[PDB]
Amino acid sequence: SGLGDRIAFPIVDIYRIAFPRNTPVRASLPYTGGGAHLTSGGNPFMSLTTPPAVLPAGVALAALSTSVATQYPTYTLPAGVYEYVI
Amino acid sequence: TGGVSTSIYDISGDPTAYPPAQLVDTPNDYFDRERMARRDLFRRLRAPADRSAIKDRAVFDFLASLVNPTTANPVLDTSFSMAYLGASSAHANADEPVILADIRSGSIPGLPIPRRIVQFGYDVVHGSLLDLSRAVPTGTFGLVYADLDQVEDAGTDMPAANRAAIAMLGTALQMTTAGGVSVLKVNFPTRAFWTQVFNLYATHATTLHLVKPTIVNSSEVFLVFGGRQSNGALRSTTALQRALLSLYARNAAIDRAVTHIPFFGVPDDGTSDLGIDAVRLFDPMFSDAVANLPSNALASLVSRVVPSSIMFTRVPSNGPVSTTIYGKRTFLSNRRRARLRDVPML
Amino acid sequence: AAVFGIQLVPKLNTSTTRRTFLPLRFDLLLDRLQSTNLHGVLYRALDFNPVDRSATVIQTYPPLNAWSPHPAFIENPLDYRDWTEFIHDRALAFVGVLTQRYPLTQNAQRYTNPLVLGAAFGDFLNARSIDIFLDRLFYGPTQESPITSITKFPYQWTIDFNVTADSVRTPAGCKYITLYGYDPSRPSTPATYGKHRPTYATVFYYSTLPARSRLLANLAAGPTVLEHFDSPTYGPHLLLPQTGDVLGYSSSLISQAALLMVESVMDALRDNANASASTAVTRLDQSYHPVTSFDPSTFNTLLQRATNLALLAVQGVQSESAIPAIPTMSDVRSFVARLMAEGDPQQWFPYRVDQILYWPESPFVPPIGPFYAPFRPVNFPFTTGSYTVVPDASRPLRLLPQYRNATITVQQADDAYEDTALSPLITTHGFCVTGGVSTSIYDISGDPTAYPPAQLVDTPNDYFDRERMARRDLFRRLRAPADRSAIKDRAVFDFLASLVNPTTANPVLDTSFSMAYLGASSAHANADEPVILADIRSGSIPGLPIPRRIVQFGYDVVHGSLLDLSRAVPTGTFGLVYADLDQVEDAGTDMPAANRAAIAMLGTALQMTTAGGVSVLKVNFPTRAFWTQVFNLYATHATTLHLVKPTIVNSSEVFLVFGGRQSNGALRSTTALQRALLSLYARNAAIDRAVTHIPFFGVPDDGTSDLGIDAVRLFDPMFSDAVANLPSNALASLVSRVVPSSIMFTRVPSNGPVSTTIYGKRTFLSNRRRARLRDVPMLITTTLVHQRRFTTPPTFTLFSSEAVPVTTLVAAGYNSFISEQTRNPNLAHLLDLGTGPECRILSLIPPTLQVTMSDARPCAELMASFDPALTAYVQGDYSTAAFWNGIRCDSATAIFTLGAAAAAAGTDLIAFVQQLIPRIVAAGGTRMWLQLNTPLYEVSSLPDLIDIDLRDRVYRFNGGERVEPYADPVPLQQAIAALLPAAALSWHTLSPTCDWLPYIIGVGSPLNLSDINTAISYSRLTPILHIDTTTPPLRVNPVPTPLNQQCAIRITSLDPAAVLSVQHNGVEVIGGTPGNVISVAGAAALQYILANQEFLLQFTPTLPGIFDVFLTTLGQPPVPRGSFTITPPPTTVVLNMPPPGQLDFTDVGNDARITCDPYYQLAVCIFKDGQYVRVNPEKASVVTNAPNRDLHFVLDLADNHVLLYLCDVTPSGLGDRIAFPIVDIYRIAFPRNTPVRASLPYTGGGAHLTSGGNPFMSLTTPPAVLPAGVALAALSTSVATQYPTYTLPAGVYEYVI
């Protein structure tokens, strides 16, 4: 009849996860039409919707989709800390 | 004035098996002249609008929420193929059922846009003519919406109606692709009909519900088969019995209410329960004097209406002024009047 | 259920309770008369025109409708405005009289006698005294009837109101009043049935039955007396109509009595059509009934017929068509016309003089009187039930056949058809081709394979036969109207805009180029010059530069000069010469004359081009004689040559294009030319075959054409399952002639009967299906007999209004393939998998072949109509193993079913087929055609038709309407080979030769040419795999099969006498014998090795793609022997770079070595706008070093922000086949400690510099006195040579662009 009707529990732990700067990390768009852009430590990084054809050094297109919807791919970043403007 | 008080019953969800032969059946008097007459009378009393538009909208509201149980994703999807197998009948001012405009426009929230829509039946214009009781050279679709009447060739001949219903159900299923969904309107959910349903189509779908909009007093229902497949295991279960019992209860309840209403053409000679009583006086002179006829008539009429409102008018003619006092008489007023031993003066 | 010309539905309905009468109270009467407006209260206008303030026909209401106007009013009617004034005056005056006597306060409760009130009021406005009536205005309803109250005074009250001891006589009041301007001749005027006349009848009220008898005795000698039995309004009464007639209602078929009956009958029908159980009514039976001077024995006058219908109407019958609430004269005429039509009279209920019989099962309820009695007809067909009416349809209807178990012999079908068909018919063609072009281009100079001109294919011998020429002209008409030249020119100029020189990879054309439209500017259509010039001058064509000026020449010019192009010309010269000249205008079929004209014009056209220019020429007839002279004379006048062939209508004309006008060219006749010509003639032959089915224009459709229309017309048909029912027989016969096509249906109401027409298109497919029949099945009539609407009249047009979608094209192509394949004489049976319930395969197969078809759903066709030995239908699911029990065949097929079945089974293709094919082999099958969906040529989604999924191997159809799995071809073929090692395999797709057209045009479906390329691509994604186990398979040594390389192919065979052929793109490319063989795809050597019983073919393919091979011997058809694929060379270009110490930021930039195949010529380009544009050499250049190509380039501060590519070089396009990003330059830093370089990045690329966060310079407009240390560099080194570079002494800078 419906999804999440009787109960719907937020996974709050994921909302608080800290990403280790010293490791390769993962990024993708958050919604079905969720345009987003990245800012590496205050420095503008990438329009994740349309990353530059000359990608920033070390970043790559990830194999598994892992986005909100499988249509979007993920992009792996070698290290660092980044922002999410959506 | 409008609106609908609908209800939905998931049948496949109930694990309690219940033999179909023990289902409740149509009441014996259901096709008595009087009950049929009241049924028609109620149909007139509803405010004028497009009955099918509201009825269809309610069903599609449910369908937009339908989600497969195994993988928790909506059964429908954008660009899905739909056949309005129900009789597209140039309803009212339009040449096709009005709900199609909303569907094509995405007006219904949560409902995806179909890639194309095809129409069938007897009264189509933008489609093809055919009888749904036989085999059909029609291909297949993802959604089959079978809004077909059965009464148009069977007034009260139940076995004839049952055969029509069963036949139409079979063809409707046959037009659905694997994993598709089909709905069917049934005029008379008869235990004989239910018997054949599980005798034949028990394996053709994964899940089943009952959608029951109420626009006027009627026993018709909407079946909905989800997950068109080959190896289903549908059974008659106690949920079905509960739904039927609740359904007939409402139908009886409404009929009892209608009994108080008079029919249309008859002038209100004071035999109906819900009639109107009125008194007319010309240049009346009310006073506390004994035997003052205007006072007596006034008190008498009031005693027949008290629980309801009392209306009053003064209309000047070219000569005298005509006064009229009136109100609705009800069975409540009768009870109150029975309590009286004498009529009080106003 | 029909009476004369009246049609009746089989359901009965009528109301169920009678409303009792109540007299009017005195006060209420005054209120009605005192109403501020009497319209809608006392009278109503049926005819009001709001534009004016006028109406012409008025309907009256009880207080007034008793009036009979004096003749002075009748002979001189007043208008509506006077009427409303007159009534309001009289009503008020009448009230005053009624109130001058009988003061209201003492009389409000009393009941008025309706009869007295009507008579009194009627006299009053007749200006006649009424005093007598006022004494008897009231009566006590509880004590007497309104009649008996009057009979208390039995004498002649007045001349128009006479009362006996038992009865009252008075003229009947006028129910309608006609104002000034009334005209019965106007068919739209409301009908009145003559009641407007003051004395149309006379009523006799009676108090008791003996009085009724007494009255009838007097009236027996006059006209027919009528009476209502059910509810006689104010009381029981006879009425005597006037003995005359009324004008305008029919062809004088009428007397007054008949009019009263027929209108009464209409009212009875209307009530039955809308009575409801919830509503009481004043009277169940609205019919009149004759009681004097009547013949029950005859039915040859209106009155008799109306009576016979009325006796039936009382039972509660309804008409098939609704009747208006306010009938007009036209409506009544139609009713009477039908009533007077020839037909049987009903005889279920007999007439009886003064008693009416009713069916006890009818919903009718009798009143208390003795005038009604129950009765039992023996075979009454009706039943109780409601029936609603559907509004009419604006479109002709379509139906889908459904059959009963009955069938009919062919002869009966034919004779039933031949006397009901519109055998000679007038039709319209419409337009077959809606628009678009199928265009193809052939580079000729690119092919190195020399081919002598004398061996070129030539024009077919019949190409100028009258019939083919006639069809050629017919096709020209059938294209939708537009500017042929506009589209044709646009296609060519699209190619020219992309033309690029091969040596230096720059576009041949340039801005401000000089152009001469040497072709005949001919004031085309509405313009004075060819319309394409407007686009050219405006730069509308993308990628095409603007010419500096345009000059025009020819015979039909206006804005130019006249001259003959066959001679020397006194002209200058131009960069582009566009020679769109016809040759046929002076040579209809004289080829040598045409050849001389073509050659001469070609020579002059070349002579007008400057060096390095480009010229094009349209050639009507590419004749081998023409080609011979071309290379005899102009072989050195240009560098390159192509062939551009747009197809707008079926024609053999082509466009030559000579690039690089120069003196020392080396053009040759080469195999590319031969390939193009063979393909060209193939299409023309294919198109001609399709057109053969189409009839010419003026000929009426006598049934000799293939694509004709068949129609049958019936008047008031009565379909039934009864034997020999002619409408049913004709219906079944016509359907049998159309089945594969759609079936149309119409109902048009004439003034009398309704004409029904059923029609559809006959096709050769229908002929094949009809040949399969042994008997004609009968149809189920419910769908048709239920249709009671009216429709628009038929259309009878051959081609629809809208082009078919791409999917249909693919379906037709595969139908064409199957239809051909099933002609093999060595097939004895066939099993079809996944047939539709409609067994469409029957239309494709020759009737002599045994067929078994299957589906989960039941078949849609009466299997009894076929020979069971030749056809069989099995209901089941061939996904299950249980399906194969007793299944025997020699061959099988499955088209457009496998992927769906696999999706339903929830599995991939490979697993699905692996468990399927063995069962077919087990069933004795030998060969099969299977429609697998897989990318044969490349993985590329069609933007909306098919989306290819990769994370799972799935196709998406129509944006996800349908979803199916897929597999890759190579793994699939290996899997198949594993299952069957000794079977041959081959692939089939839509041919670019369009041989499948007759299955699109010949079936009457329109088309758009531009879709064809997509359809082919669609087929490339959904090939048909042909598996054959009765022949050994093909084999080749270098399995990867690389291009341009020697490969050996073995075809084991027993006869050295056999002959071989190989095809590519649907045309033979190699063929011959081991002794001698001819090829147009590279070196080919054919030998037969008897010791191995093989033909050996050694081959060096010069082009990629699918190649299929056949063997043939003199007494046999050609035999397929598998197919093979040739792969293109690899796309891997690699660059090799210097160390950072050799990153030359100096003026002399550094150099990088390129490692690549020589097959791809390369140049440095910029992906500016979706297309690569070649960069100027002074920033980067591919180096033609002797051992290999290298890459010199220079470094500039713009490089990191831009992208540049090594692009494939072809004269057709730049970077088409490969385009490799030169990634290093995108990400190379610049040393701060050195002099550096900067310039603008684009042709109009404004830029500004920011030195280390400090604004530095607007590089577009740098400071007039430059910042210290910077200088203008010597070498350009910018993106384009026009911009200079600026050298900066040191530092780090930004680029804002």
Curated annotation (Swiss-Prot), chain B:
It is found in: Virion. It comes from the Viruses. Coiled coil: none annotated. Outer capsid protein involved in mRNA capping. Catalyzes the last 3 enzymatic activities for formation of the 5' cap structure on the viral plus-strand transcripts, namely the RNA guanylyltransferase, RNA-7N- and RNA-2'O-methyltransferase activities. Belongs to the aquareoviridae outer capsid VP1 protein family. This is Outer capsid protein VP1. It comes from Aquareovirus C (isolate Golden shiner/USA/GSRV/1977) (AQRV-C).
